[PDB]
């Protein structure tokens, strides 16, 4: 938290080396296999943990609306079904995940569920997961690791192509429905 | 005369003026209260549009129209044939309305007076009259 | 299904993939390619072209009358969070079509349709469904008092 | 959170915030109100020690063209007054670290002070050597062993490249 | 999909959005060739003369920017045929001679089809994409 | 090394080139100018024209030469984005070395010649230009071209 | 930054929350986790002596 | 050794310690020191100045023209950013210096010369390297087409 | 009547508007943009430096040397032997042209004009009219 | 070295760098006092009207304000010779009677000497400070 | 004690009295600023010039008289310098009341006299002067430095 | 602090030899090279310091950090260090002749 406070002095799409370090890399060598920092921070065991997107993970939390849609405080749950890893290029991991919400909409309980799909890019410890085919107004989630660990993320639902928050979301892993 | 480098200017110069929505409008509403400041005796013209009142929508549709029109014409700056097609157009809308034609000189005027506070680049004055005076030049008889 | 805010912002956003250039090029092929469909499906739309030489598409005429519509479209979008100036030009857009004697309602709907099959095809993340909702308010007000 | 403190102040730090002058930590007489301006740990004199050196990589952003390397600054004498006690004057090599291939490694030679109260190394040309650097070092990580250095013009301070530092 | 006048305009687009600011481009370049010969390891011996042992060495730095810049030329004329036909016509001069199989034109095109989403992050589509390369990496074969 | 085409110089030279390229039809901006400097260069020195036969010059408005202009304005953007990493730009700059010295009837001449039309341009084009920086340092690159040259 | 608007409290968690300052210790729980319920112990009991330096 | 732009900030910047002031004293003082070294290496040069009173250093119109060097160079130094103005003004001193015969490029090098010699002695961190690196730039400029 | 507090705040608040070389190169391109703006019948005595293009190189240096000679005045408002010599040189450089004297009263206009706009404080009308005239009573024949 | 025209201007310039921005005023005097009084502690009895036995004292840091002052005219009329002379005879007539040795202005040279680079910390002369410093020094004695 | 002279006054003072002394030329300007403070009080009051004879008032030009215009300035500045600490003020205001003690012929009068003109003057040459606090302050300095005069 | 018996006329003080660079080949890993700096501390009088720029290796199983002048550097100084107290931070080092070998002075070293 403190470290985001600060910020850095890197570009955008660049990787700070250590916490106090100078050196800068380029997000596209983050986990690639290669040692690029001169002191091998990129290619560090908490920068490249995998967990975060583990299948069979189930983040839950409320989702707080304030723009698109008119919703109540609500359950959304981002549910990681499956993940990719290619050898040759390992700087990413592309993730797919179905994205639950619980809407008490009229009276009733009702389920609004999507497939989606999108990746876990380690440098900015971000998960994006944009709805797979659904053009039938589901939104993006946008969540970030930002809280230490791999078991809780501060997310938005936003509107994929400009990136506009619609809701505030923080996830934590709970785990097992 | 209006050369290669010349309008590579006045389009980069442009784009920064008009490229931006945020500080177009007041772009163009500029423009116009400089060029009714000091030329009140164009306002007759703008009748059709409350040039009176330039803070109405009337009007500021009109400066919307104007300011896109320019904007066709700087850019295709580069292709002579669609140019001409459309200074043409531009004649054509013009034509009609009994317009003296030097008051194109007092419009550029009022464009080189504006322009540098929407600029983070020096003005190319030069690029500036020759690219507007070949497009004066063709909506004019 | 109205052209909410969002609608608008979204449109807004996006809008400066779509052609947006200080150079003409981009805005002739899409356009270009909006009217090749709106022709491939009511082709009678055609005939009212001739004064811009349709016949000869790659003429500076007919050039210049692509980038005059994209432009038209391009004022529209930018007027969509100043509504009294947009119905303003919205009006005068209006009227210049009433002018021309032969467009009708229907083909508004077409060029709706052609508008819509073409823009997905030109950049990603082009949100159609707001496309469609708010074109259905911006030609309905062009093309009212027109002939269906 | 920073500090209150007006040029040529330092903060006591402690429970209650207070500001006094730089030149007035680890003299002798305690001008802080809790006497922390005294205090063994602030008047630390480690960081100024002979042979202390400090390395760390360098990102340039003007003057060198070179690609992000180690710089290291070493100090080689240093002197405190009996008399003026609040600032320990040192002599200090800057050096950077250069590939096999170089060979004709460039060292600068420099001369100042650490203040106790700044917590800061600051360092110029030697005298008649040619002013091309000089050195900041702020050891704000709360020892001895850290610091946030500058490579700086000596005439503008302007900011030629940084490194975090490290005691090695 | 195919290469239309439309789907070549929008990769035209996207290749602005990721090549089109020095900043990170030979880092970009990098990143696809390390793709690449991750796939292909036997390709390396290829590079022999440009140092494709050490993708970070100088001169092979310069190679992969050399690529990437034959390459823009190729994205930025897919509107312009005739220009694309003559560049095409170039880097295939370029590359006769060179047995250079299938292969690894297929690896080339994987390690682009990975950087290119990673790099844009957002808005891309790998079919336009797909097959404006296989346009290009036909033009380069013959 | 230092001094001629310093750090700074080389900041200043990729600041400013770097406003010529704004929007997505950077290409037509590109060939333009590479056409500009090209035909200007064969104007003031008519024996060049020649030398460009195979990229069909006579027919600048074509696609073979429009796409060879893409090909030096590519180089020439290459070269300064590569001043951050001088050894990598010497690389880079020593494989044009090679790619001109193949081509017999090139001369340093010329390139002092382009150098001359180059800034001239550069001076119009862009709003904001150090000549002291980006002649320190073109010095060097155009130099570094013209290095392998017989003539 | 704050995490609630000017005149709310954050219920804190790792599902936070914001409820105006208005209903924090009323007796009424208005947290999902009861946050604005368990704040209160009133620091000050009568007798209490604070002294506070310059 | 050529001007680097580093240089020319490094002047920039230490400029505001020589001199400068909304008071002319400091100009005439060390402009006057400059003078006093140049006509004690080359004191042909000397001669050059009578219309300004060499001969009577305390008078107003000797102090009147050292000013005016000394703000020359103001300009010339504030001008390193702006290379286009630079040449033009560069060009007008070095027309100012054509029309007074018996001005040398010679006398100039000397001038380059008791500047680096005075300079230092009146503020420290000057960087002389840098200095007479952009001097032989603007010298050189102004004293072309003067004789060699 | 330009007395030692005059010249004392005329100082000051030059030393603000042209002592930051930031704003300095602005300050001078608006001073000479009002001037012209106000009184064109003046831009015929400018052709030896594109005084209808104030955005060219030529014309830049121009205002540059102007700014740099009113610091030399300004900056002698107190040593009156050097002040009169300095005075004395501007004339020889105003006199071989046909100026109107009355021109100086516009050119003083324009500076007040322009100068608040680069002061941090409140332009000291007065003296710098005071000391503008004693400027060019000496500048004049 | 010497105090010249020229290292006067330098030490004049140096001094309105350290002096001239009444903040740390109190504290760069008092500073200067702290050093002096190290070196020579016989000397505070010279100071009982103005309590030299607390530095801390108000009226202690009244008197090192009006030294301060004192040698501040002394500084800004190195290059008004006439002007100088004056205040360096104010000064002796100030200090005649009192039996200040050699010894004490050496002190207070030194104390001067090693605040002020601590005060400006970046550049400056001890030489010119030194030459400059023995002028006015010599002023004051006689 | 507060409201007269308060605090905010205080800072008032010292942040408008320091627009003044902007640049390295400042001597010039307290001798300029005391010299017409000074004359403008010996022709205010004319019995006043004499007790000025021991620093050459006669010639205002002159070396002395401007060493002692900086004397008078510096002692103006220590004091606006000195309201921070009302104890070391106070002690500093009283040497000077001693010092204007032992110059017989000093009357509060002229005291009062040269208030009026300070004020006068700082209207012109600050642009920015809060009367009410100056006024506030200055009675309280000039009074304490007057405090000790016979007449 | 050093001890001298020759070559330096000076009396007792600190020597300080400083890595500034170092490279450990891949193929060949018993030793590890490095670009070194001596340096002496000298008087506040002096303002004239004396640097000899060094270049050498460390070797593992000596334990032994040897130095000699940086190539065209005029042969003066040798430093041997040899880490024999158990740590990675003392070392009894000579101030040698590159050549001879010949002792000059000797300091016992301690990493700061
Ligand atoms: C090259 C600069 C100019 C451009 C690009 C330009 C362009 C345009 C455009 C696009 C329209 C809209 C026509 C329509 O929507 O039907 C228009 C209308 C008009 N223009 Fe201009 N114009 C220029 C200069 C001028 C000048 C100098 C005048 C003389 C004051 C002028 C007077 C008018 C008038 C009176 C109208 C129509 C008013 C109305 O619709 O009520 N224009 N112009
Ligand atoms: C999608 C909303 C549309 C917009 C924003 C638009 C825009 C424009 C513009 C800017 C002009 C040029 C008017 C001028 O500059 O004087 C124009 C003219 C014209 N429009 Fe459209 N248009 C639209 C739809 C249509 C439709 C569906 C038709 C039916 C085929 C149509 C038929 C025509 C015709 C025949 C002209 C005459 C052009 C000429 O003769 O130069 N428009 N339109
Ligand atoms: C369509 C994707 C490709 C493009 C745009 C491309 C473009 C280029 C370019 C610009 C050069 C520099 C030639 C010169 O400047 O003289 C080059 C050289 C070369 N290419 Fe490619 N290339 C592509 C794919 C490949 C493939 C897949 C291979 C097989 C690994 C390959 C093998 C080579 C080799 C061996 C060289 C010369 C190496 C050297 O410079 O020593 N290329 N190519
Ligand atoms: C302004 C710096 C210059 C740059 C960056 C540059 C760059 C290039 C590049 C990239 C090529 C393409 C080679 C290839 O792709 O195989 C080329 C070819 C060529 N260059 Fe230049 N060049 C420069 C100056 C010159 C000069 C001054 C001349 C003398 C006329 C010259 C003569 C040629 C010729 C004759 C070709 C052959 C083109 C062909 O046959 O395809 N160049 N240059
Ligand atoms: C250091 C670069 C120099 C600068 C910036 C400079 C600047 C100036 C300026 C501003 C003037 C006044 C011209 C006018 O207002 O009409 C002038 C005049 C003159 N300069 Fe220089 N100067 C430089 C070097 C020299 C050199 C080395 C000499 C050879 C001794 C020289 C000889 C003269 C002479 C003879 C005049 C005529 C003054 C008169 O009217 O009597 N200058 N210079
Ligand atoms: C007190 C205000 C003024 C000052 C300080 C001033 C100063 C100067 C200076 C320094 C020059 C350059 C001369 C040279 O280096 O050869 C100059 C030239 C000139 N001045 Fe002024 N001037 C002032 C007012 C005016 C007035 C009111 C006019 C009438 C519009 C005027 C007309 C000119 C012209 C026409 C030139 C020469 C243009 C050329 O060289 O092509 N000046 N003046
Ligand atoms: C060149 C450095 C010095 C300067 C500029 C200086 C200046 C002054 C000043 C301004 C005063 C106040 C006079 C008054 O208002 O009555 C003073 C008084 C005095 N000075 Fe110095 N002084 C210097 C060095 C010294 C030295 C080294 C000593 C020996 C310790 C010394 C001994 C004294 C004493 C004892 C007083 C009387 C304080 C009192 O009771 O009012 N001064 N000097
Ligand atoms: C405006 C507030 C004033 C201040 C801050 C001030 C300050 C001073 C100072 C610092 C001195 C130098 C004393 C020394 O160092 O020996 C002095 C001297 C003197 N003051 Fe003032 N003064 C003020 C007002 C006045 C006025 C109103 C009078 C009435 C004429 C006056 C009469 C004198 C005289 C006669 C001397 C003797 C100077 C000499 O002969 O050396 N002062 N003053
Ligand atoms: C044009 N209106
Ligand atoms: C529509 N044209
Ligand atoms: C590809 N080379
Ligand atoms: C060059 N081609
Ligand atoms: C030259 N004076
Ligand atoms: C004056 N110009
Ligand atoms: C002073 N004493
Ligand atoms: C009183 N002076
Ligand atoms: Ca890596
Ligand atoms: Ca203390
Ligand atoms: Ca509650
Ligand atoms: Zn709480």
Redesign the interface.
Known sequence: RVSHVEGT?C?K??FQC?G?????I?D??VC?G?KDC?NGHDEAEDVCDTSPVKPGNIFS??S?WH??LLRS?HVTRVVIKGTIR????K??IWVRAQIESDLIHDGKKELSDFDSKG?Y?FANRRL?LIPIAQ?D?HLSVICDFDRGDSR?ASCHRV??????QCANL?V?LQGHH | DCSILELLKVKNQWREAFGEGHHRVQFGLELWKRFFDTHPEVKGLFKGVNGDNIYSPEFAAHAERVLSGLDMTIGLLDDTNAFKAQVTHLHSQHVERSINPEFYEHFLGALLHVLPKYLGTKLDQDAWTKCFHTIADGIKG | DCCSAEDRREIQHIWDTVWSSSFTDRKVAIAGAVFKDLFHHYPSAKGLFERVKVAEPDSGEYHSHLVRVANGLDLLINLFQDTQVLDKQLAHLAEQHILRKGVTQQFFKGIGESFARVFPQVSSCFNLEAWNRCFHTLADRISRDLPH | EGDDCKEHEAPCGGDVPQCISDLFFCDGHKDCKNGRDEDKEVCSEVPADIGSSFAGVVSWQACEEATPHHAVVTITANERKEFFKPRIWVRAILAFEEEEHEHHIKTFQLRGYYSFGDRTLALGPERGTKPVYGVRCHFDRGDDDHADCQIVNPASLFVCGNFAAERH | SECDVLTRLKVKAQWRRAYSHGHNREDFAQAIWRALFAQVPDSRTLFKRVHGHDTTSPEFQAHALRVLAGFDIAISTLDQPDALKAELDHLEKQHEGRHIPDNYFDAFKTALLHVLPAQLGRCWDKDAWSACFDHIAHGIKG | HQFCCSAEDRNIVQKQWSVLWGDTESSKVKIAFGRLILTKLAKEIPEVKELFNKVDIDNPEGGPFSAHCLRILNALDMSINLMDDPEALDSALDHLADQHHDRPGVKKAHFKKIAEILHTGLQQVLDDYNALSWKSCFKGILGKIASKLQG | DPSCPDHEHQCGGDDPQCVSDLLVCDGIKDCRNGDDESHCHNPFHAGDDFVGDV
């Open positions: 002095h570009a799409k660049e250590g106090y370090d100078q050196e800068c380029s596209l060598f690639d290669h001169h939390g409320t707080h723009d698109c405080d290619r050898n040759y290029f700087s990413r990746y890019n994006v053009d107004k809780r509107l994929e192509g400009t990136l506009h923080s934590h």
